[PDB]
Design an enzyme around this catalytic site. Sequence first.
Site, PDB file in Angstrom:
ATOM      1  N   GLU A 151      38.699 -25.173  -4.354  1.00  0.00           N
ATOM      2  CA  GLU A 151      40.061 -24.669  -4.264  1.00  0.00           C
ATOM      3  C   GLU A 151      40.594 -25.233  -5.569  1.00  0.00           C
ATOM      4  O   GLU A 151      41.062 -26.369  -5.632  1.00  0.00           O
ATOM      5  CB  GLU A 151      40.824 -25.249  -3.079  1.00  0.00           C
TER       6      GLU A 151
ATOM      7  N   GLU B 166      34.294 -28.639   1.114  1.00  0.00           N
ATOM      8  CA  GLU B 166      35.420 -28.207   0.308  1.00  0.00           C
ATOM      9  C   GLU B 166      35.969 -29.260  -0.648  1.00  0.00           C
ATOM     10  O   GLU B 166      36.057 -30.439  -0.306  1.00  0.00           O
ATOM     11  CB  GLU B 166      36.526 -27.722   1.249  1.00  0.00           C
TER      12      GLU B 166
ATOM     13  N   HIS C 122      36.084 -28.406   6.579  1.00  0.00           N
ATOM     14  CA  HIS C 122      37.347 -28.087   5.906  1.00  0.00           C
ATOM     15  C   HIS C 122      37.950 -29.335   5.237  1.00  0.00           C
ATOM     16  O   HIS C 122      37.856 -30.426   5.793  1.00  0.00           O
ATOM     17  CB  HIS C 122      38.347 -27.524   6.923  1.00  0.00           C
ATOM     18  N   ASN C 123      38.579 -29.165   4.066  1.00  0.00           N
ATOM     19  CA  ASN C 123      39.191 -30.286   3.322  1.00  0.00           C
ATOM     20  C   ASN C 123      38.372 -31.551   3.555  1.00  0.00           C
ATOM     21  O   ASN C 123      38.883 -32.584   3.998  1.00  0.00           O
ATOM     22  CB  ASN C 123      40.645 -30.510   3.766  1.00  0.00           C
TER      23      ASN C 123
ATOM     24  N   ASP D  40      39.329 -29.736  -3.188  1.00  0.00           N
ATOM     25  CA  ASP D  40      40.617 -29.276  -3.706  1.00  0.00           C
ATOM     26  C   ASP D  40      40.778 -29.988  -5.040  1.00  0.00           C
ATOM     27  O   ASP D  40      41.023 -31.193  -5.084  1.00  0.00           O
ATOM     28  CB  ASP D  40      41.759 -29.664  -2.761  1.00  0.00           C
TER      29      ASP D  40
ATOM     30  N   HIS E 169      44.857 -33.460  -1.486  1.00  0.00           N
ATOM     31  CA  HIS E 169      45.561 -32.372  -0.839  1.00  0.00           C
ATOM     32  C   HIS E 169      46.878 -32.361  -1.614  1.00  0.00           C
ATOM     33  O   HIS E 169      47.730 -33.235  -1.425  1.00  0.00           O
ATOM     34  CB  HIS E 169      45.790 -32.692   0.638  1.00  0.00           C
TER      35      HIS E 169
HETATM   36 CA   LIG Z   1      41.875 -26.935   0.799  1.00  0.00          CA
END
Ligand SMILES: [Ca+2]
Lengths: 696, 177
Positions: free
Chosen positions: A369, A318, A288-289, A320, A335
């Site tokens: 994302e 991931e 995640h992230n 973003d 983020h």
């Molecule tokens: Ca994210």
Amino acid sequence: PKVKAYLSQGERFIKWDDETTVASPVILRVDPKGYYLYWTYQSKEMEFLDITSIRDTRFGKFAKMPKSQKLRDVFNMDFPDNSFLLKTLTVVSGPDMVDLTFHNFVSYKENVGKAWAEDVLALVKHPLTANASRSTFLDKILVKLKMQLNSEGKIPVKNFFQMFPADRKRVEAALSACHLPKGKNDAINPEDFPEPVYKSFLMSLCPRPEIDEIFTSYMTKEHLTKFINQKQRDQGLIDKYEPSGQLSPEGMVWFLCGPENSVLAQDKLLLHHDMTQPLNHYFINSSHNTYLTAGQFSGLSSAEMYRQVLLSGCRCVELDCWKGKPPDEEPIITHGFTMTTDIFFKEAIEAIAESAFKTSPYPIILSFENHVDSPRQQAKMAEYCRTIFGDMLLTEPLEKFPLKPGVPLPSPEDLRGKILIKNKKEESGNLDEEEIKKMQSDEGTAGLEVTAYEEMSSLVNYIQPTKFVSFEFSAQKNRSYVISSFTELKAYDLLSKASVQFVDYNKRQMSRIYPKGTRMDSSNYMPQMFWNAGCQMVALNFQTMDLPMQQNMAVFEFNGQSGYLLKHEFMRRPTTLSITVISGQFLSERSVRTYVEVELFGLPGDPKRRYRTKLSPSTNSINPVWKEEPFVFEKILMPELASLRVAVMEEGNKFLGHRIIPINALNSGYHHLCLHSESNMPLTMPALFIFLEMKD
Amino acid sequence: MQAIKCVVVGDGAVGKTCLLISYTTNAFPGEYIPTVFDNYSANVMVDGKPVNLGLWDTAGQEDYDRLRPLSYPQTDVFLICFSLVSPASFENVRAKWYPEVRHHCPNTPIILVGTKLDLRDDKDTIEKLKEKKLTPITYPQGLAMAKEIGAVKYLECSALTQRGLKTVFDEAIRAVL
Ligand SMILES: [Ca+2]
Ligand SMILES: Nc1nc2c(ncn2[C@@H]2O[C@H](COP(=O)(O)OP(=O)(O)OP(O)(O)=S)[C@@H](O)[C@H]2O)c(=O)[nH]1
Ligand SMILES: [Mg+2]
């Protein structure tokens, strides 16, 4: 894994930045047994690096590059058409994904770095390097003690105190028991410390009376036979382990520490799962992230995280994505709406292309994302992917698997060496401070993405993200190439209201789970619950080695750390365990009381009782012995889905070491459980002596 | 146990490595192999005192011009070598080695060493030199060169016969103490 001769022979390099601006000539080598990568300076001084501490090796353009002008000049880097890239070597080491050390070497000869990088990494990534038997780790200690000599060519007694720091008195008495000098500022001739003198030294420092009790039940070749068939089940050994057809207790100790007695069915560590089933029929190692190295709100982002997770077999990462400002108009990754630093979208792609298939040949999924509300920058993004990933990028569906209803997803094999992009191909829009205000606690920035333009849309095929509506809606559409993403909270809520349909959904489609926005500390949620439901991409914060990641690293080490685990056939088709914690050896570098916890991760109906050992009898951590009854786990429904956790802590709860092992990979009998760190790396000193029993 | 770092430099093929091997092992190398970098040691008694002599071998090849100096930090004494039967290597003492050493270590003692003493009077070598339009370097020349570069001592030796060999290292040690 055999160490090629040239490695032990050695090669000349110039190690730089081991200081600052300091370039030092050295001879780099790997000892014959493959325990250490060590370099020797001209002054004879040596520096050791455990092979088990290495995370990656790089050469040429992927190697770290010196920044200081002084080093740039020394290496003639600012020279037209030089050959610097033919001489760079970088060895990356560290206790986890974040706390990294880069060991940089420049060779005198050209092209030797490539061989070193590839051969050293193959030793590191060999499944049996980390899973050797207790005897191997005890041997690493010996090799170290006898390799780190002083100017007189002797082993400083001081080095024994540093190797076994918990209690000097006991170390001194052990040396004396072996007629060796006990004294801060004595040295021992290496020829005076061979095997089995080292073994006698260990027996003196770390007596093993619990093993004497096994005898109460010497030992004739017949008795030993009875022992192996009754305890270790479901003459050459005596010759190999007995120090001097009878087996003494010391002989029993060494036998039990040997490779013939492994706690794991080692074949399980190799890639052996059937890799031809549909993609969604596997548990997929997920991050995640990924770009974050700390902290979700404050902390730095780094493209290096991608390399690190991928090198451990992570298969889903991931990104973003956010728009860059002029004059460059370069997309970035961060983020959004926090204080985390930024990295360029491009560097993440370069990091991924590099490490994607170094340790696993199976397909990877890039979870985008997207917040890039700019057709030009989205085009840049697609361009970077196509050009940098090249043939690795799956730009179009496979002939045998059209994107049509009723068609199943391709298999990991069908998509071998391929990179899949998960991006929108439904509400869209830019996030506002207020809009992120009421999402911050749950979905976070993932709660709303921008529209996908033509360039990015064309790259999406088998992993198409759509907002979840309902399980019947999904079942109605019958599209196996659509993926649903849920926060740990939403996914938990769905399991409480529609568990039956959630389970059925995962047989046809993918579901990705990720941390709730409230976990700003980057803590993780326990994954079992979701794997139980068939969820395949249970994304965790890899920079945080808390229990959930401890289990994640442990279970995905199996099947060749490919990042894929085939679900039980009952999750694809359209036993009682007893463990007795007997004793522990060199559990801590200091004298402190210790305890052990044992529990099982499995199905809802699996045994849920948790056990905690009583505190060790005293601050003795060299060889504490407990007096515990067997810890029982009755009626484990599906061994394949369950794992056993054995963790050692010192009084006060500080982590010392552990092992999380899938039930079907456990062997029975008396064993020396070699402990691992939170990130599942092998620890040399700590070990537990246990007795396992499996019954139906 | 006083330790001393002695770095040996000079043109390629002047005999630096044979110098170190012959001295530390009393055996003469059987195959010429260009040096990248190497280290030899020797415990010796000088003026009634034990000394741990560290001998750092360097590359004579000019391809190592930027890398070679990496061995210079904290050097106690340098041996600048040239072949007594190679006027070119002799000229390089002043044109290359002296300037290079002083650039990195401006105050470190230097000892000038004339190598291959055994060949100066050798007939075959001389004829070979005459055909090359050359001639050996004489002691007075060596001594004069030493004065010019400020060497603490000028010494000639042969690694092959070992004549003058041990003296070179005793003086190297005494130049430091
Ligand atoms: Ca994210
Ligand atoms: N006759 C004679 N030959 C010598 C003597 N010392 C060295 N040589 C010869 O000189 C050649 C080169 O010697 P060596 O010691 O390898 O040079 P080097 O200065 O160390 O060369 P490099 O490492 O910078 S390229 C060899 O063939 C060796 O046998 C000597 O004292 N007498
Ligand atoms: Mg040489």
